[PDB]
Design a protein around this nucleic acid. Structure first.
Ligand SMILES: [K+]
Ligand SMILES: [K+]
Ligand SMILES: [K+]
Ligand SMILES: [Mg+2]
Ligand SMILES: [Mg+2]
Ligand SMILES: [Mg+2]
Ligand SMILES: [Mg+2]
Ligand SMILES: [Mg+2]
Ligand SMILES: [Mg+2]
Ligand SMILES: [Mg+2]
Ligand SMILES: [Mg+2]
Ligand SMILES: [Mg+2]
Ligand SMILES: [Mg+2]
Ligand SMILES: [Mg+2]
Ligand SMILES: [Mg+2]
Ligand SMILES: [Mg+2]
Ligand SMILES: [Mg+2]
Ligand SMILES: [Mg+2]
Ligand SMILES: [Mg+2]
Ligand SMILES: [Mg+2]
Ligand SMILES: [Mg+2]
Ligand SMILES: [Mg+2]
Ligand SMILES: [Mg+2]
Ligand SMILES: [Mg+2]
Ligand SMILES: [Mg+2]
Ligand SMILES: [Mg+2]
Ligand SMILES: [Mg+2]
Ligand SMILES: [Mg+2]
Ligand SMILES: [Mg+2]
Ligand SMILES: [Mg+2]
Ligand SMILES: [Mg+2]
Ligand SMILES: [Mg+2]
Ligand SMILES: [Mg+2]
Ligand SMILES: [Mg+2]
Lengths: 181, 238, 46, 101, 336, 124, 393
RNA sequence: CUCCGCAUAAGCCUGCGUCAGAUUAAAACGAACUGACAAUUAACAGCCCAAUAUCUACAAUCAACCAACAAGUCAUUAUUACCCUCACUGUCAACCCAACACAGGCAUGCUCAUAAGGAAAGGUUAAAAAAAGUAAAAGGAACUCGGCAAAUCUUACCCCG
RNA sequence: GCUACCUAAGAACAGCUAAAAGAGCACACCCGUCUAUGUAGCAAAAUAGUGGGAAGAUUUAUAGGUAGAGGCGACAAACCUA
RNA sequence: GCUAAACCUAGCCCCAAACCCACUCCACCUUACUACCAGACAACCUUAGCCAAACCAUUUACCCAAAUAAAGUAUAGGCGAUA
């Protein structure tokens, strides 16, 4: 019920609520998918309750009791996602060999940049899609000059950064002259 | 620019069609003809200028009944709704065309010339010399392109070697094949050229914009020029 | 009469006149975006 | 779910199912007087009222009769020390009415 | 700016809110019959009601597919139209008033009134008094107007030991929305029409509020609310508009009650209501020392039939048909 | 005079603009004639929520738990744990051929499955 | 001849195919593998696509000739058809003879003052004022609004006479009913598909109007022709049709007999309203269609002079002008132009009122004309009442 | 006092709600400024439509008399296909375009003087010159380039178009 | 997105006289004749009064079109973001 | 005595060397940053002018692939300026 959005009524007003550790990737890697599926919702309901308490704390202009509880729940849920993702990624590689779940391709755009074009789902073939064909996946010669100017802009930035580091290394030897070795 | 001609309808109908004004602009959006703009909104009634158009499954001469003669905003002449068989179409009305009349659209050329009734469409070869004719085509089956304005009429001058010589309203002769179909009589609204605009505003209603105020000195082009009538224009190939 | 109020805002007009799609519709407009990208503009277009 | 691709549905296809949802909601105290049966939430922007009904019923077993939602504008008025506008994020508010008195 | 009150409403528990806006107490059952000092052919009436029911469902052949979402308008709406039309024709011998009555089809009914006050919370008008204004725009599927008023169900000063429900929040939470537009007080015809009094209204619930859908949305307990809310709002507007046609208003309260009846249906289940308007003094000023209350009587909805299979009407309920007939037989008391 | 820097949202622009732009909610149907929306049940995500009765795992873990080394799962490890034992056993029995690879769990094509790994056709 | 549709508006022709396709033994390198257009590769030739499943919102119907009901002979289908020659064309199509005025049998019903409605003139005047003035909140009700109501209220006024005539309780007014009837005229296949208006349905068939002597006397009458216009002008020439003969109700309907057909011409715009002659033609064809459907049901699909003629009435109005028709179907042997002919009694152009003023006409602060009906004619309602009372009083 | 006012559209985007800060409004402790916390809930509105063929001569104006020209905003049918339902978005304000809390600009409905919305004077004194008004003996254009201005409510001509 | 002209589809025009109207009187509305004030002003063209038109060649909201060797112009060398 | 004054870092410039270049999920050519439909439009084509010639009208240097030298030579040019 709606009581699950709030902590145990005995904990209301307590300055600190003790909590255990966040689940680790290795500990979760020993559990079955069904157990991880159930644990997700156990962690999910805890997250909602902690989010409810955090907002009410701001409403009342009071500090949230044990704010580290929320960080732990987020870390545990992030670890659970990673564990489940690893299992699906390994299965996809074995059965298909594809490194990514979503199809895509390397494309050049109207601005001459190389981009990874993530594919979208459609019901009609691409040669009949009016909106898709309006997109330009190629660059005309007038873009060439701009690509060079952008490359040169990058080169200047990189050159300044490298020269500055060398200057800083010399300032360091001046302050601490015993770093010759 | 994104100008699209309103003349997109492909199937003939007698329903007045919504038309879009140009303002004298071309497809580029630049003014191409000056002095055009505004005016009353108008709907286009599609006029069939091929008087001898037999119905899909029919052939040979056919008659039509005049249902109504009415004002047309898109042209000086009046137009007549005619019905024959299961088909209705707009045509140009003749001077004395009235509702209830019957008109004959024939393609038959006989040894003797027919008795020409006003409003009937016959081949030029079938008409007596001197008949007042209108809506004349240059080549057979092309459709009427001449003598279409209010009150205009031509005259059949000669008939030689399967050809007909017509006098155009401008008085310039016009040679055509005798099989080219024409309509007998003068076009409706004989008094069109007698209308008085009366005030500047009425020209604005007709979609005419005022002339430029720039003063132009007249040049050699101006002044009366007495020139010979141009040589007979011929559409027959020998 | 009094001037200075030439701007009569309209989102439809603003998007149509200076929008992203409009800019990309011609090579000159694409070059506009490329110049602004090279300068590092936060706003490439309206 | 949010920030995921939804499998495209075609007539006669399988039911779309989500197994581990990443929608997280917080029950908030109403700022104004509300009817006794009304419960206020702040839900993700991509969550529909249909999702919230099934979300509350499936996970929390809360019988829901009606759900209304609105999109609250977050202020973009504040300015940092660089005179750059600071955007308070927009959030969606849901109003859930209980179903059985 | 005024609140738009919809008689046919999706809002939960709207009947309780509508009672507050209209100062109406609701009573279960029908009004107490008056004890005061031609044969009715039940067989004939039942056959006409079954004939109409079978016509729309079976006999009348449809050129086009009738989809489920179209069923209310394509099937149910003609039924209630024809059912009301024939019954009044057959019942003219028993009730002479019906012969001269005006039968309208989907004619608007408008009522505008002021109930309560609020302090403007925000803006340049903050802190100033503003009247809470309401508008009902109703379209009864059918209605019957008469030139002579029906008799009151109870006395004008009738008192009941039942308090009118109160709301502890703004009307906007129902939800209810504000809009500004023409304020119409309309009984179904202009004031020039002699038939300025109301007899019976027949309402057809829309597909959006169909019984099947309310059960799917965990709203089983709102089924009867939907009927009650539509009855209270519709008849309050109709009787209210009738009173104002006679020159009464908040500062000149009605000197006699204004009664009307409503039949509410979804095409199968029928519910019967009676409304007595005892007071129009609903403004804060005029309601300060107003003991009068408006009264609405209502029955629980009952199915007129169970199923329809081919050309057979299964489980036809004679009691529901009799209740329709009883309202149509009501007539003004004849003066001496 | 327009604000170029602020996010473009459905709150901005005229009535037509405001109703065409959304907030990223996935559609669950289509509009029919008369602006009538048809909700598709199959397009609405169905929350598969498990029964949590007698479930022993709690939101947090005890601090008195021995630390372990992180070893991310790999395709090789999964194959060794799941597929290699069966292949090793049939190899000893003497009945092993490429034709039976489907017996050991290889899927030649993803088409025809409800949950297809690539392109992925199911939700997290 | 002039061809309609300028080329600039027509679909642009496909660009010239790349010349690599012409060379034999050469495989063009196209951008199909890249899945997007590039200017420097050849345009792929894509094979035709088929969705391969049913999507109702993206359906494409089969070619017209491949439809199961496609027939080489055309059926000319007649509520939206506006006949050019009006009644004359309708008279030919239905092989019927026209008698001006309503039958004496019908008109005698209202000559007795016992059949008159109490306060008839005032009652009818209130009906006009209601429909034209008091109906809505709008100052001036539009014809799409008052035209249906004025007919409904007049029927309601006539239905008040159930007291005097108990037989008026054996009829109902049905909405949304349709009927179809197919017959042949001079080898032309004709179909009337009736829809719209109200069908007054009775349990008992209407008494026959014309004696067997008048029916036989129609043999001499010759149907008038109107060359050069075809009898089928303004009909829908259809090449996909079913020879359907339908009364609009399934077998067993308690009120199977059509008594009156109330046809409305309620369009607000004058060009969208049938001319008086066109409305009378629609009434004749709809009355004939209803009668023919009944005859084909009761007496089979054979072609024969009917021993029991079928009588159907029709009332057509635009809200102010009323047309009255009594149609008797004497024969179903319609293919020939000679023999017993059907009979139609038509009373045309019956003005119920001349004009209605919704606002007072004030010239120089003087009310020249008051609000209300102008030129009310009670005789028009007397004919309306007589048609209603027919078969009951 | 009332120029309005209320609402819608367009535009704008939290821009006088709560709590607290002494930050400040061309003055001022109220706050439009700062920080935190609140809020606008769909019925109104936006977001619509299977295909192929086919159909659509007869304005509007109280649409009825009558007269028009500049000749007009509103329409289907046949066959095939079609079972499903109420999602999404807008909803705040003392507001917009004029560098401003600018005497300017700003579409539509209703109200036709109001039931709505407002305050011309920070206090004092009562010089000059200046601004806006009111009254004026006798005279009545003597003014002035000119009856400009004001007052009054007027005759007869001329040039040009 | 101002302005000149055009295109699409919209909206507004009380009362009185005449009842025919690019008719008269006169609101809303459009324009800006004359005087005064103002002149870093309330305003980079305004205010007050007085005026021209106000069913038309009228005014006006929305979207769109014509771009500088050019556009547009009832020619003022007008107007095309002070 | 106020207002102020004072500071040494942030980083930057010119060379050398070395070819250069991305990536979490989701969104983004339609009104970009917008899950989901019948299209088919497609890139190239001599720079000019200021300016110098004391006006100006032919003409008037612009990395184009080895520093140096041949050499400001041969040669070109209102045989002028200059190249
Ligand atoms: K003309
Ligand atoms: K704002
Ligand atoms: K100003
Ligand atoms: Mg023209
Ligand atoms: Mg000229
Ligand atoms: Mg000139
Ligand atoms: Mg500016
Ligand atoms: Mg503008
Ligand atoms: Mg909403
Ligand atoms: Mg709606
Ligand atoms: Mg508001
Ligand atoms: Mg300014
Ligand atoms: Mg006030
Ligand atoms: Mg003051
Ligand atoms: Mg003072
Ligand atoms: Mg002072
Ligand atoms: Mg004096
Ligand atoms: Mg003097
Ligand atoms: Mg004098
Ligand atoms: Mg002097
Ligand atoms: Mg003066
Ligand atoms: Mg002049
Ligand atoms: Mg136009
Ligand atoms: Mg006027
Ligand atoms: Mg005038
Ligand atoms: Mg004037
Ligand atoms: Mg002057
Ligand atoms: Mg203006
Ligand atoms: Mg001009
Ligand atoms: Mg000049
Ligand atoms: Mg000059
Ligand atoms: Mg400028
Ligand atoms: Mg020089
Ligand atoms: Mg010089």
């Amino acid at each position: 019920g709606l009581e699950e959005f709030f902590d145990d009524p005995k904990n209301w007003g307590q300055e600190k609520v003790k909590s255990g550790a966040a689940w680790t990737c290795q500990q979760l890697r020993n559990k079955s998918n069904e157990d991880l599926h159930k644990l997700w919702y156990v962690l999910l309901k805890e997250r909602n309750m902690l989010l409810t308490l955090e907002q009410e704390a701001k409403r009342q202009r009071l500090p949230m009791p044990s704010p580290e509880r929320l960080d732990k729940v987020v870390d545990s849920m992030d670890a659970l996602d990673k564990v489940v993702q690893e299992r699906e990624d390994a299965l996809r590689l074995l059965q298909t060999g594809q490194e990514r779940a979503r199809p895509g391709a390397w494309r050049r755009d109207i601005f001459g940049r190389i981009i990874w074009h993530k594919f979208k789902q459609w019901v009609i073939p691409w040669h009949l899609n009016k909106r898709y064909n309006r997109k330009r996946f190629f660059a005309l010669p007038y873009v060439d000059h701009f690509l060079r100017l952008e490359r040169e802009k990058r080169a200047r930035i990189k050159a300044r950064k490298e020269n500055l580091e060398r200057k800083k290394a010399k300032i360091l030897l001046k302050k601490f002259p015993h770093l010759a070795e | 620019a994104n100008f699209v001609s309103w003349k997109s309808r492909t199937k003939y109908t007698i329903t007045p069609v919504k038309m879009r004004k140009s303002g004298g602009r071309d497809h580029t959006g630049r003014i191409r003809v000056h002095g055009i703009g505004g005016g009353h909104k108008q709907r286009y009634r599609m006029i069939d200028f091929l008087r001898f158009r037999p119905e899909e499954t029919k052939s040979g001469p056919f008659e039509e009944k005049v249902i109504q003669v009415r004002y047309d905003p898109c042209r000086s002449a009046d137009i007549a709704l005619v019905a024959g068989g299961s088909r209705k179409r707009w045509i140009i009305a003749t001077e004395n065309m009235q509702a209830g009349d019957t008109i004959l659209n024939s393609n038959h050329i006989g040894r003797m010339a027919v008795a020409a009734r006003e409003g009937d469409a016959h081949p030029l070869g079938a008409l007596p010399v001197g008949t007042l004719i209108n809506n004349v085509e240059s080549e057979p089956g092309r459709g009427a392109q001449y003598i279409r304005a209010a009150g205009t009429c031509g005259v059949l001058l000669r008939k030689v070697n399967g050809t007909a010589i017509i006098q155009l309203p401008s008085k310039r002769q016009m040679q055509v094949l005798e099989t080219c179909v024409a309509t007998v009589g003068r076009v409706s609204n004989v008094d069109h050229n007698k209308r008085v605009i009366g005030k500047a505003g009425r020209n604005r209603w007709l979609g005419k914009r005022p002339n430029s105020g720039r003063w132009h000195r007249k040049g050699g082009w101006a002044g009366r020029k007495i020139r010979p009538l141009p040589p007979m224009k011929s559409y027959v190939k020998l | 009469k009094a001037r200075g109020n030439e701007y009569q805002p309209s989102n439809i007009k603003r998007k149509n006149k200076h929008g992203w799609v409009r800019r990309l519709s011609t090579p000159a407009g694409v070059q506009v975006i490329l110049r602004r990208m090279l300068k590092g503009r936060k706003s490439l277009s309206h | 779910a949010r920030n995921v691709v939804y499998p495209l549905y075609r007539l006669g296809g399988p039911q779309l199912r989500v197994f581990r949802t990443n929608f997280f909601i917080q029950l908030v105290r109403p700022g104004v007087a509300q009817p006794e049966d009304t419960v206020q939430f702040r839900i993700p922007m991509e969550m529909t009222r249909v999702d919230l009904r099934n979300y509350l019923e499936g996970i929390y077993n809360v019988p829901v009769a009606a759900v209304r939602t609105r999109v609250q504008h977050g202020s973009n008025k504040r300015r940092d020390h660089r005179n750059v506008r600071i955007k308070k994020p927009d959030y969606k508010v849901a109003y859930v009415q209980l179903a059985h008195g | 700016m005024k609140y738009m009150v919809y008689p046919q409403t999706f809002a939960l528990n709207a009947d309780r809110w509508y009672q507050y806006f209209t100062k109406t107490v609701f009573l279960s059952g029908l009004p107490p019959p008056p004890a005061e000092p031609p044969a009715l052919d039940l067989a004939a009436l039942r056959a006409v009601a079954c004939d109409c029911l079978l016509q729309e469902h079976f006999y009348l052949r449809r050129r086009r597919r009738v989809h489920r979402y179209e069923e209310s308008e394509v099937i149910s709406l003609p039924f209630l139209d024809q059912l009301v039309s024939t019954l009044v024709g057959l019942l003219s011998p028993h009730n002479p008033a019906l012969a001269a009555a005006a039968l309208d089809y989907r004619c608007p009914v408008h009522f505008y009134w002021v109930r309560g006050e609020e302090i403007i919370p925000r803006g340049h008008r903050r802190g100033r008094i503003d009247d809470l204004r309401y508008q009902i725009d109703d379209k009864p599927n059918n209605q019957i107007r008469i030139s002579k008023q029906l008799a009151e169900f109870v006395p004008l000063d009738y008192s009941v030991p039942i308090e009118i429900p109160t709301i502890k929040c703004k009307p906007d939470k129902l939800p209810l929305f504000k809009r500004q537009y023409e304020n119409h007080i309309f009984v179904g015809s202009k004031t020039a029409d002699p038939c300025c009094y109301g007899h019976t209204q027949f309402h057809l619930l829309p597909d959006k509020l169909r019984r099947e859908r309310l059960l799917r949305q965990n709203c089983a307990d709102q089924i009867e609310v939907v009927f009650r809310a539509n009855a209270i709002a519709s008849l309050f507007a109709w009787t209210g508009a009738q009173a104002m046609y006679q020159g009464f208003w908040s500062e000149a309260d009605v000197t006699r009650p204004f009664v009307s009846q409503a039949v509410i249906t979804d095409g199968k289940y029928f519910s019967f209501f009676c409304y007595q308007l005892n007071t129009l003094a609903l403004t804060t000023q005029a309601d300060q020392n107003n003991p009068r209350k408006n009264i609405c009587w209502g029955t629980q909805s009952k199915p007129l039939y169970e199923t329809i299979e081919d050309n057979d009407v299964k489980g036809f309920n004679d009691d529901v048909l009799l209740q329709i007939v009883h309202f149509l037989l009501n007539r003004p008391k004849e003066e001496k | 005079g327009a604000d170029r820097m602020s996010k473009w949202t459905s709150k901005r622009g005229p009535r037509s603009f405001r109703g065409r732009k959304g907030r990223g909610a996935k559609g669950i149907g289509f509009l029919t004639s008369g602006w009538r929306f048809v909700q598709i049940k199959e397009m609405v995500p169905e929350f598969v929520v498990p029964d949590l009765t007698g479930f022993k795992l709690k939101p947090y873990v005890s601090y008195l738990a021995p630390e372990s080394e992180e070893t991310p799962l790999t395709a090789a490890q999964l194959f060794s744990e799941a597929v290699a034992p069966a292949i090793e056993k049939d190899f000893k029995d003497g009945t092993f051929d490429p034709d039976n690879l489907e017996k050991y769990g290889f899927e030649p094509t993803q088409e025809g499955k409800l949950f297809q790994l690539y392109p992925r056709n199911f939700l997290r | 001849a002039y061809e309609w549709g300028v080329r600039s508006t027509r679909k642009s022709e496909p660009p010239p195919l790349d010349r690599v396709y012409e060379i034999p033994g050469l495989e063009p390198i196209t951008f199909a593998g890249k899945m997007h257009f590039v200017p420097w590769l050849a345009r792929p030739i894509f094979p035709p696509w088929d969705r391969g499943y049913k999507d109702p919102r993206f359906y494409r119907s089969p070619p017209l000739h491949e439809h199961p009901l496609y027939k080489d002979q055309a059926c000319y289908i007649f509520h939206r058809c506006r006949l050019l020659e009006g009644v004359k064309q309708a008279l030919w199509l239905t092989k019927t003879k026209l008698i001006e005025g309503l039958p004496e049998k019908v008109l005698s019903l209202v000559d007795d003052p016992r059949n008159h409605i109490e306060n008839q003139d005032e009652c009818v005047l209130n009906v006009i004022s209601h429909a034209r003035l008091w109906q809505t909140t709008e100052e001036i009700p539009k014809r799409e609004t008052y035209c249906p109501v004025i007919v409904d209220n007049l029927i309601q006024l006539c239905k008040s006479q159930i007291l005097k005539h108990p037989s008026l309780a054996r009829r109902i007014c049905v909405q949304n009913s349709t009927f179809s009837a197919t017959w042949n005229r001079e080898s032309l296949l004709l179909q009337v598909r009736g829809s719209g208006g109200a069908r007054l349905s009775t349990k008992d068939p209407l008494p026959t109007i014309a004696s067997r002597e008048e029916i036989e006397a129609t043999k001499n009458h010759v149907l008038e022709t109107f060359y050069p216009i075809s009898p089928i002008i303004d009909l829908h020439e259809c090449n996909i049709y079913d020879v359907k003969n339908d009364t609009g109700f399934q077998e067993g309907y308690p009120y199977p007999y059509p008594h009156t057909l109330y046809l409305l011409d309620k369009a607000n715009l004058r060009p969208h309203r049938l001319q008086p002659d066109q409305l009378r033609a629609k009434m004749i064809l709809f009355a004939f269609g209803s009668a023919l459907a009944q005859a084909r049901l009761l007496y089979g699909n054979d072609a024969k002079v009917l021993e029991q003629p079928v009588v159907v009435q029709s009332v057509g109005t635009d809200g102010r002008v009323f047309h009255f028709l009594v149609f008797q179907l004497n024969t179903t042997d319609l293919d020939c132009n000679e023999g017993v002919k059907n009979l139609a009694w038509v009373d045309s152009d019956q003005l119920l009122y001349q004009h209605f003023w919704c606002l007072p006409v004030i010239k120089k602060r003087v009310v020249v004309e008051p609000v209300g009906p102008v030129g009310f004619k009670p005789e028009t309602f007397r004919k309306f009442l007589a048609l209603y009372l027919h078969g009951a009083a």
